């Protein structure tokens, strides 16, 4: 067929010139049907035409074309994991990018491909959908919607193990496990399998992206033959034999060897050699089926600088003491280890390490550099109890506050009764012994009424410095000086209280509530303590005794001494320490010196959860003996104590406690395991059967003058209460249920059968 004209239809983004030649036929050529399915397959093989039809007109040869749609943009939706550029990156490589003309036959293949990439992270299956939105002229927007779901695991199996059962190995989120493989490799090396090898690790999978199986294949036997030391030993050959000691029947272990390699290296380090080298080569004997260890030792002064780095909170002066050797002096590798812990013990940092660097232009000098890595600590509590009621307490701590080494604690407390606020500066390791400086500045607002006592108010302030120097690790002694100022006010007149006021030389009205007393006291405080408790929390054996002794130093308005002693003793009954016998005792006795009396705010009191359970807080001891008085806010059909306005003409016996100068309490508990709680968590729970005994009295009481009144000087009146106690470390915080029955109770003693207290931090 003679072609005298050729024309192309549907050409847009592809010019004539292109087509004209990139087809075998041309104007003036003779054409057959062979040249048809060559021309077509050739123009199709241009990869630029959506579709092609090349056929003959009478004289003309006409090309009917549809050009491929040119990509204008590639948009992605649903791809939370894979970055949009990353996803574009994969596509650009495949052949699909903006400007390229898309092959509407490969979308499926593009889908398979992106789906294929999606194994990169956890999604081993998902669905990618092609939106191929048309645009102007013959352009297209290929949008991609990703249905990506996110890895699963339940079976971890070992094949080729004859030395151990799979379960026996299982004795010790899974997305990537590398260190864990090394840990289970060490399982075999620890049992003597030096010729143990992991041949392969397969990750099998079920149809969905959520179902993984881990198969670890193994090749597992050997033991120790002996240790042979050889090198420039530096004459310490006598010592090294002790380090390389071996027990007969020792199964080989590469870490224990390294421990010895480091121990030799440490010894030679202690002897002044900076870089001692210890190498070990194992002589493999498959014949004996035992390795013979060949150890090559190669032993290789002064300190210009002792550097401090990482101290971005603690200034570069406080840390200058925590070690066992000075700068501009000889190096002692052991002295570096002795003082190594000294930085950790402070709890001022987090991580601490050493580095020994050679001094620039020196053949013997080395700079020892210690790298130290938060100091602000915030502690907040809120509780509820029988004593304290709703109790608020908070403390702010800064251990390296503005680089002083001293720790500053600002703590505030508010119970139902007293409100306490203190500012503290502490140094737990001020000197060689481990002596502290218990600096304290404070404020205490005391409300006697809320403390279940006879009414009075004490607002007090002052300071204390207490230096505690340890003696025995079991015995610790503390001693210090304290100044206090107490402004007593609003005291409801009673014999007992007034008695003391008369001792001081102060004489107020016994019919008026209007009164105020101000004292300034200086005191010398001492406190001995012994502790041989096996555990600070829930002890099961040992004993703790505490002694407290206050004494007024001349110049103070008051003149008294106070002495208390706390005893706690635990005695275990079973070999597992689950059944214990407890013995608590508290003694207390203070008194006036200058013919005076000890202040009533410094009295001892018994009762509550604290002491003698079963009784209301502080209810034990002497009771008030009120004087007839006129109440300020007097209202009838309201109860008052010995109010003249209620018809009071003489002294009144009462129920309100006042406490006293002498007191003693004791308890004999019997700890047992909690009844139904499992051993798995039965370490947080303490049941207890206690027998409590207690008394408070007043040695300054006048039995003779007040005949119509009980003898508040008689100590013979012992109260006793027996019960059950339960302590838990519930999530809420610490707690106790102390249900007691006070069988032995005396006059007006108020009962409180169910007691308890809770915390939080």
Partner 1 sequence: IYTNAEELVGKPFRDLGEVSGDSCQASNQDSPPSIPTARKRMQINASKMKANAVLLHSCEVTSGTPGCYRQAVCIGSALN
Binding site for partner 1 (CB under 8 A): 179-180, 183, 341, 344-345, 347, 350-352, 377, 379, 381, 383, 385, 393, 395, 397, 399, 407, 409, 411, 413, 415, 417-418, 420, 422, 424, 426, 428, 438, 440, 444, 535-537, 544, 546, 548, 564, 566, 568, 582, 584, 609-610, 667, 669, 725, 727, 729, 733-736, 738, 756-761
Contact in structure between 688 and 726 (CB atoms under 8 Å) = yes
Nearest distance from C-beta of residue 257 to partner 1, angstroms: 18
CA separation, residue 693 to residues 250, 544, 562, 618, 722 (Å): 61, 19, 22, 14, 9
Cα(10)–Cα(19) distance, integer angstroms: 12
Q: Give kind and range of the element (H or E) at residue 179.
A: helix 179-189
Cα(719)–Cα(619) distance, integer angstroms: 11
Choice between 310 and 748, CB closer to partner 1: 310
Cα(695)–Cα(665) distance, integer angstroms: 6
Choice between 544 and 623, CB closer to partner 1: 544
Choice between 95 and 347, CB closer to partner 1: 347
Choice between 180 and 241, CB closer to partner 1: 180
- DSSP secondary structure code for residue 192 in this structure: T
Choice between 23 and 666, CB closer to partner 1: 666
For strands 686-697 and 735-744, give the pairing.
unpaired
- If you write DSSP's letter for every residue of 543-558 in order, what string do you get? EEEEEEEEEE-BTBSS
Contact in structure between 78 and 148 (CB atoms under 8 Å) = yes
Cα(22)–Cα(45) distance, integer angstroms: 9
Nearest distance from C-beta of residue 154 to partner 1, angstroms: 20
How remote is the C-alpha of 612 from its chain's centroid?
35
Q: How many residues does the chain have?
A: 761
Nearest distance from C-beta of residue 451 to partner 1, angstroms: 8
Nearest distance from C-beta of residue 349 to partner 1, angstroms: 10
38 contacts: CB under 8 Å, gap ≥ 6: 24
Contact in structure between 668 and 690 (CB atoms under 8 Å) = yes
Nearest distance from C-beta of residue 724 to partner 1, angstroms: 13
Nearest distance from C-beta of residue 411 to partner 1, angstroms: 5
Nearest distance from C-beta of residue 621 to partner 1, angstroms: 16
CA separation, residue 740 to residues 506, 527, 552, 661, 693 (Å): 42, 32, 39, 26, 12
Choice between 341 and 364, CB closer to partner 1: 341
Q: Give kind and range of the element (H or E) at residue 167.
A: helix 166-169
Choice between 265 and 686, CB closer to partner 1: 686
Nearest distance from C-beta of residue 631 to partner 1, angstroms: 28
Nearest distance from C-beta of residue 692 to partner 1, angstroms: 11
Q: Give kind and range of the element (H or E) at residue 262.
A: helix 254-270
Choice between 261 and 416, CB closer to partner 1: 416
Choice between 292 and 371, CB closer to partner 1: 371
Nearest distance from C-beta of residue 667 to partner 1, angstroms: 8
Choice between 62 and 410, CB closer to partner 1: 410
Choice between 417 and 697, CB closer to partner 1: 417
- If you write DSSP's letter for every residue of 380-401 in order, what string do you get? EEEEEBSSSSEEEEEEEEETTT
Cα(653)–Cα(658) distance, integer angstroms: 12
646 contacts: CB under 8 Å, gap ≥ 6: 636, 640
Choice between 661 and 667, CB closer to partner 1: 667
- DSSP secondary structure code for residue 749 in this structure: P
How remote is the C-alpha of 232 from its chain's centroid?
48
Alpha-carbon Rg for the chain, nearest whole angstrom, is: 45
Phi, psi torsion values for 628, nearest 5 degrees: -65, 125
Nearest distance from C-beta of residue 747 to partner 1, angstroms: 26
Nearest distance from C-beta of residue 253 to partner 1, angstroms: 15
Cα(110)–Cα(97) distance, integer angstroms: 12
Nearest distance from C-beta of residue 636 to partner 1, angstroms: 36
Nearest distance from C-beta of residue 397 to partner 1, angstroms: 5
Nearest distance from C-beta of residue 734 to partner 1, angstroms: 5
Q: Which two tokens stand for residue 494?
A: 């009673």
Choice between 40 and 318, CB closer to partner 1: 318
Contact in structure between 720 and 744 (CB atoms under 8 Å) = yes
Of the candidates 144, 134, 147, which has an alpha carbon nearest to the alpha carbon of residue 96?
A: 144
Q: Report the SS3 class of residue 203.
A: strand
Choice between 272 and 733, CB closer to partner 1: 733
Q: Give kind and range of the element (H or E) at residue 237.
A: helix 237-243
Choice between 325 and 411, CB closer to partner 1: 411
Choice between 176 and 507, CB closer to partner 1: 176
Cα(429)–Cα(341) distance, integer angstroms: 14
Q: Hey, how many other C-beta atoms are within 10 angstroms of the C-beta on 180?
A: 12
Choice between 163 and 726, CB closer to partner 1: 726
Q: Hey, how many other C-beta atoms are within 10 angstroms of the C-beta on 472?
A: 10
485 contacts: CB under 8 Å, gap ≥ 6: 460, 461, 462, 518, 519, 520, 521
Nearest distance from C-beta of residue 727 to partner 1, angstroms: 5
Cα(301)–Cα(174) distance, integer angstroms: 51
Nearest distance from C-beta of residue 693 to partner 1, angstroms: 15
Choice between 417 and 701, CB closer to partner 1: 417
Angle (deg, nearest 10), helices 254-270 and 179-189: 90
CA atoms within 13 A on the CB side of 554: 0
Cα(199)–Cα(555) distance, integer angstroms: 87
Cα(320)–Cα(326) distance, integer angstroms: 9
Q: Which two tokens stand for residue 278?
A: 């210890």
Q: Which two tokens stand for residue 61?
A: 């040869």
Nearest distance from C-beta of residue 487 to partner 1, angstroms: 16
């Amino acid at each position: 067929f003679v072609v005298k004209d050729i024309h192309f239809e549907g050409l847009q983004r592809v010019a004539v010139g292109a087509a004209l030649l990139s087809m075998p036929v041309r104007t003036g050529d003779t054409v057959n049907d062979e040249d048809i399915s060559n021309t077509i397959r050739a123009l199709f093989a241009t990869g630029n035409f959506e579709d092609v039809r090349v056929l003959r007109d009478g004289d003309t040869l006409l090309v009917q074309v549809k050009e491929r749609p040119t990509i204008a943009s590639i948009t992605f939706s649903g791809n939370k994991s894979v970055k949009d550029d990353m996803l574009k990156q994969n596509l650009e490589a495949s052949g699909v990018r903006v400007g390229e003309s898309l092959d509407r036959t490969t979308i499926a293949d593009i889908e398979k491909g992106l789906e294929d990439f999606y194994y990169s992270v956890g999604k081993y299956s998902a669905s990618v959908k092609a939106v191929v939105t048309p645009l102007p002229r013959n352009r297209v927007d290929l949008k991609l919607v990703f249905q990506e779901g996110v890895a699963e695991i339940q079976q971890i199996n070992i094949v080729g193990n004859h030395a151990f059962t799979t379960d026996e190995l299982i004795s010790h989120q899974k997305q990537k496990l590398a260190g864990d493989l090394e840990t289970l490799r060490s399982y075999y090396l620890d049992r003597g399998y030096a010729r143990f090898n992991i041949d392969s690790t397969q990750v099998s999978l079920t149809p969905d992206k959520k179902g993984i199986y881990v198969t670890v294949n193994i090749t597992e036997q050997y033991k120790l033959s002996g240790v042979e030391v050889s090198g420039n030993l530096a004459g310490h050959s006598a010592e090294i034999e002790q380090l390389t000691k071996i027990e007969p029947g020792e199964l080989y272990n590469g870490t224990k060897v390294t421990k010895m390699e480091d121990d030799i290296k440490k010894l030679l380090g202690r002897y002044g050699y900076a870089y001692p080298r210890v190498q070990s080569m194992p002589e493999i004997n498959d014949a004996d089926k035992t390795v013979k260890l060949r150890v090559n030792v190669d032993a290789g002064f002064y300190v210009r600088k002792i550097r401090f780095e990482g101290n971005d909170t603690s200034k570069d002066a406080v840390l200058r003491r925590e070690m066992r050797q000075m700068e501009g002096a000889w190096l002692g590798s052991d002295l570096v280890d002795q003082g190594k812990e000294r930085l950790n013990r402070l709890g001022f940092f987090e991580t601490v390490d050493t580095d020994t660097q050679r001094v620039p232009g020196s053949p013997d000098q080395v700079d020892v550099v210690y790298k130290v890595k938060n100091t602000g600590s915030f502690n907040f509590g809120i509780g509820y109890g029988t004593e304290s009621g709703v109790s608020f307490q908070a403390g702010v701590q800064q251990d390296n506050w503005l680089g002083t080494g001293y720790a500053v604690g600002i703590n505030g407390t508010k119970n139902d009764y007293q409100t306490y606020a203190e500012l503290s500066v502490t140094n737990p390791y001020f000197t060689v012994d481990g002596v502290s400086l218990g600096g304290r500045l404070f404020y205490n607002d005391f409300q006697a009424d809320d403390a279940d006592l006879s009414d009075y108010t004490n607002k007090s302030y002052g300071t204390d410095v207490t230096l505690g120097f340890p003696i025995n690790e079991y015995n610790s002694l503390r001693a210090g000086l304290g100044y206090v100022h107490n402004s007593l006010s609003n005291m409801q007149p009673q014999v007992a209280m007034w008695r003391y006021l008369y001792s001081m030389g102060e004489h107020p009205s016994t019919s008026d509530q209007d009164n105020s007393f101000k004292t300034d006291d200086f005191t010398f405080n001492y406190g001995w303590t012994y502790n041989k408790l096996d555990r600070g929390y829930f002890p099961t054996d040992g004993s703790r005794v505490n002694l407290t002794g206050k004494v007024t130093i001349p110049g103070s308005d008051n003149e008294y001494y106070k002495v208390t002693l706390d005893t706690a003793t635990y005695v275990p009954i079973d070999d597992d320490h689950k059944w214990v016998v407890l013995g608590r005792t508290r003694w207390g006795y203070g008194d006036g010196l200058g013919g005076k009396e000890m202040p009533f705010y410094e009295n001892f009191y018994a009762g509550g959860s604290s002491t003698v359970r079963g009784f209301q807080s502080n209810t034990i001891g002497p009771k008030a003996v009120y004087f007839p008085h006129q109440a300020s806010n007097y209202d009838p059909d309201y109860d008052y104590e010995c109010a003249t306005q209620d018809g009071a003409k003489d002294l009144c016996k009462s129920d309100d406690a006042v406490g006293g100068n002498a007191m003693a309490v004791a308890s004999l508990e019997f700890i047992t395991p909690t009844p139904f709680i499992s051993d798995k968590y039965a370490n947080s729970v303490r049941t207890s059967f206690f027998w409590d005994m207690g008394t408070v009295w007043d040695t300054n009481w006048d039995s003779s003058q007040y005949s119509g009144y009980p003898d508040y000087s008689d100590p013979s009146n012992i109260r006793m209460s027996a019960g059950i106690a339960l302590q838990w470390m519930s999530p809420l915080g610490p707690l106790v249920f102390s249900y007691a029955q006070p069988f032995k109770k005396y006059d007006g003693d108020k009962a409180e059968q169910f007691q308890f207290n809770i915390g939080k931090t």
